[PDB]
Design an enzyme around this catalytic site. Structure first.
Site, mmCIF file in Angstrom:
data_model
loop_
_atom_site.group_PDB
_atom_site.id
_atom_site.type_symbol
_atom_site.label_atom_id
_atom_site.label_comp_id
_atom_site.label_asym_id
_atom_site.label_seq_id
_atom_site.Cartn_x
_atom_site.Cartn_y
_atom_site.Cartn_z
ATOM 1 N N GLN A 1 -6.591 12.654 -11.099
ATOM 2 C CA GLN A 1 -6.341 11.425 -11.848
ATOM 3 C C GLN A 1 -7.619 10.698 -12.285
ATOM 4 O O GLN A 1 -7.573 9.814 -13.138
ATOM 5 C CB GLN A 1 -5.471 10.464 -11.027
ATOM 6 C CG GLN A 1 -6.169 9.867 -9.808
ATOM 7 C CD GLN A 1 -5.233 9.069 -8.935
ATOM 8 O OE1 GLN A 1 -4.432 9.626 -8.194
ATOM 9 N NE2 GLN A 1 -5.337 7.746 -9.013
ATOM 10 N N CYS B 1 -1.832 7.404 -9.893
ATOM 11 C CA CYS B 1 -1.195 8.238 -8.861
ATOM 12 C C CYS B 1 0.344 8.242 -8.958
ATOM 13 O O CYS B 1 0.992 9.276 -8.758
ATOM 14 C CB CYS B 1 -1.635 7.793 -7.467
ATOM 15 S SG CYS B 1 -1.299 6.030 -7.103
ATOM 16 N N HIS C 1 -0.793 4.206 -2.473
ATOM 17 C CA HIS C 1 -1.038 5.521 -3.110
ATOM 18 C C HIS C 1 0.245 6.333 -3.159
ATOM 19 O O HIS C 1 1.060 6.248 -2.256
ATOM 20 C CB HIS C 1 -2.160 6.256 -2.368
ATOM 21 C CG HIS C 1 -2.635 7.494 -3.058
ATOM 22 N ND1 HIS C 1 -2.904 7.540 -4.410
ATOM 23 C CD2 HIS C 1 -2.920 8.728 -2.576
ATOM 24 C CE1 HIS C 1 -3.307 8.757 -4.733
ATOM 25 N NE2 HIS C 1 -3.319 9.500 -3.641
ATOM 26 N N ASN D 1 -1.879 15.905 -3.268
ATOM 27 C CA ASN D 1 -2.559 14.721 -3.801
ATOM 28 C C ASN D 1 -2.930 14.992 -5.259
ATOM 29 O O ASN D 1 -2.720 16.120 -5.756
ATOM 30 C CB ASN D 1 -3.810 14.424 -2.943
ATOM 31 C CG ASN D 1 -4.282 12.961 -3.024
ATOM 32 O OD1 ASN D 1 -3.785 12.162 -3.808
ATOM 33 N ND2 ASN D 1 -5.265 12.623 -2.201
HETATM 34 C C1 LIG Z 1 -2.510 4.874 -7.673
HETATM 35 N N1 LIG Z 1 -3.579 5.414 -8.167
HETATM 36 C C2 LIG Z 1 -2.581 3.420 -7.187
HETATM 37 N N2 LIG Z 1 -1.442 3.132 -6.327
HETATM 38 C C3 LIG Z 1 -0.165 2.840 -6.760
HETATM 39 O O1 LIG Z 1 0.146 2.740 -7.937
HETATM 40 C C4 LIG Z 1 0.845 2.634 -5.658
HETATM 41 C C5 LIG Z 1 1.749 3.879 -5.691
HETATM 42 C C6 LIG Z 1 2.795 3.800 -4.581
HETATM 43 C C7 LIG Z 1 3.641 2.519 -4.738
HETATM 44 C C8 LIG Z 1 2.794 1.234 -4.847
HETATM 45 C C9 LIG Z 1 1.663 1.344 -5.880
HETATM 46 C C10 LIG Z 1 0.792 0.106 -5.783
HETATM 47 O O2 LIG Z 1 -0.301 0.133 -5.230
HETATM 48 N N3 LIG Z 1 1.250 -1.075 -6.330
HETATM 49 C C11 LIG Z 1 0.288 -2.193 -6.499
HETATM 50 C C12 LIG Z 1 -0.250 -2.201 -7.941
HETATM 51 C C13 LIG Z 1 0.945 -2.276 -8.842
HETATM 52 C C14 LIG Z 1 2.188 -1.813 -8.469
HETATM 53 C C15 LIG Z 1 2.495 -1.178 -7.141
HETATM 54 C C16 LIG Z 1 3.024 -2.062 -9.519
HETATM 55 C C17 LIG Z 1 2.259 -2.659 -10.492
HETATM 56 C C18 LIG Z 1 2.830 -3.037 -11.702
HETATM 57 C C19 LIG Z 1 4.191 -2.782 -11.890
HETATM 58 C C20 LIG Z 1 4.965 -2.174 -10.907
HETATM 59 F F1 LIG Z 1 6.277 -1.973 -11.135
HETATM 60 C C21 LIG Z 1 4.378 -1.800 -9.698
HETATM 61 N N4 LIG Z 1 0.985 -2.805 -10.087
HETATM 62 C C22 LIG Z 1 -3.832 2.612 -7.132
HETATM 63 C C23 LIG Z 1 -2.779 2.356 -8.268
#
Ligand SMILES: *C(#N)C1([N]C(=O)[C]2[C][C][C][C][C]2C(=O)N2[C][C]C3=C([C]2)C2=C([C]=[C]C(F)=[C]2)[N]3)[C][C]1
Length: 215
Positions: free
Chosen positions: A19, A25, A162, A182
């Site tokens: 990525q 991710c 993640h 991963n």
């Molecule tokens: C990857 N690369 C990263 N991690 C994620 O996207 C994780 C994946 C597993 C679920 C949670 C997610 C996360 O960290 N969140 C915080 C940031 C974020 C999320 C969820 C989210 C956002 C916008 C809309 C939405 F519906 C969900 N922002 C490091 C990105």
């Protein structure tokens, strides 16, 4: 459910991707679960497009993160996801360039595994194929993992940061594990994979946010 499963041995798993610096991710995890169901349904394994998801799943935040469930719902409502070849990965956000001529899979919705239930996750992996999961990947020990069954008591099941792909499960030297693909490249971990402790009280939150697409 069998005592061990490994979908990589059955041609359900595409090569490990990278990525890069983008926080996509969730897209790679989503794509991997879609790839597995496509192989199961049609008999063809192909790379699907994480970039399509990054750019087009409007409620997620592209390189800033997102949920796999929202990704699956997009593929459903969109009536398609493009192949990697039709919409290649560039690791930065851009406007949506989805093209239905590049479509390589469809989605009829998704199912979620009961929160925190590793028994349920095992059964799903066994019955369905690879399953999208979220974990705490923030520890130094995870970052520089090389071999063995990963466990660190500092792992926080309430810090899901993640998304990865559960492609199987098994045991090594008497310690049960999940086989996790991963998206940090083939040079990370063990050829891009990590074995994570299984049935050790939901280590790293591995069963807290697991889902898979219906096809
Ligand atoms: C990857 N690369 C990263 N991690 C994620 O996207 C994780 C994946 C597993 C679920 C949670 C997610 C996360 O960290 N969140 C915080 C940031 C974020 C999320 C969820 C989210 C956002 C916008 C809309 C939405 F519906 C969900 N922002 C490091 C990105």
């Amino acid at each position: 459910a069998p005592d061990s499963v490994d979908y990589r041995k059955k041609g359900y798993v595409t090569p490990v991707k990278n990525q890069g610096q983008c926080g996509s991710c969730w897209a790679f995890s989503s794509v991997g679960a879609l790839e597995g169901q496509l192989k199961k349904k049609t008999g063809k394994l192909l790379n699907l497009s994480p970039q399509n998801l990054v750019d087009c799943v409007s409620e997620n935040d592209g390189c800033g993160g997102g949920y796999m469930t929202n990704a699956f719902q997009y593929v459903q409502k969109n009536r398609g996801i493009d192949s990697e070849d039709a919409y290649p990965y560039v690791g930065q956000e851009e406007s949506c360039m989805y093209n239905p001529t590049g479509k390589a899979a469809k989605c009829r919705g998704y199912r979620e595994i009961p929160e925190g239930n590793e028994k349920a996750l095992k059964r799903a992996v066994a019955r369905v194929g690879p399953v999208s999961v979220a974990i705490d990947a923030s520890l130094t020990s995870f970052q520089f993992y090389s071999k063995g069954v990963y466990y660190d008591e500092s792992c926080n099941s309430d810090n899901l940061n993640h998304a990865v792909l559960a492609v199987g499960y098994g045991i090594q030297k008497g310690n049960k594990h999940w086989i996790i693909k991963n998206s940090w490249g083939e040079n990370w971990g063990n050829k891009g994979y990590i074995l994570m402790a299984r049935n050790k009280n939901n280590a790293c939150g591995i069963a807290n946010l697991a889902s898979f697409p219906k096809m």
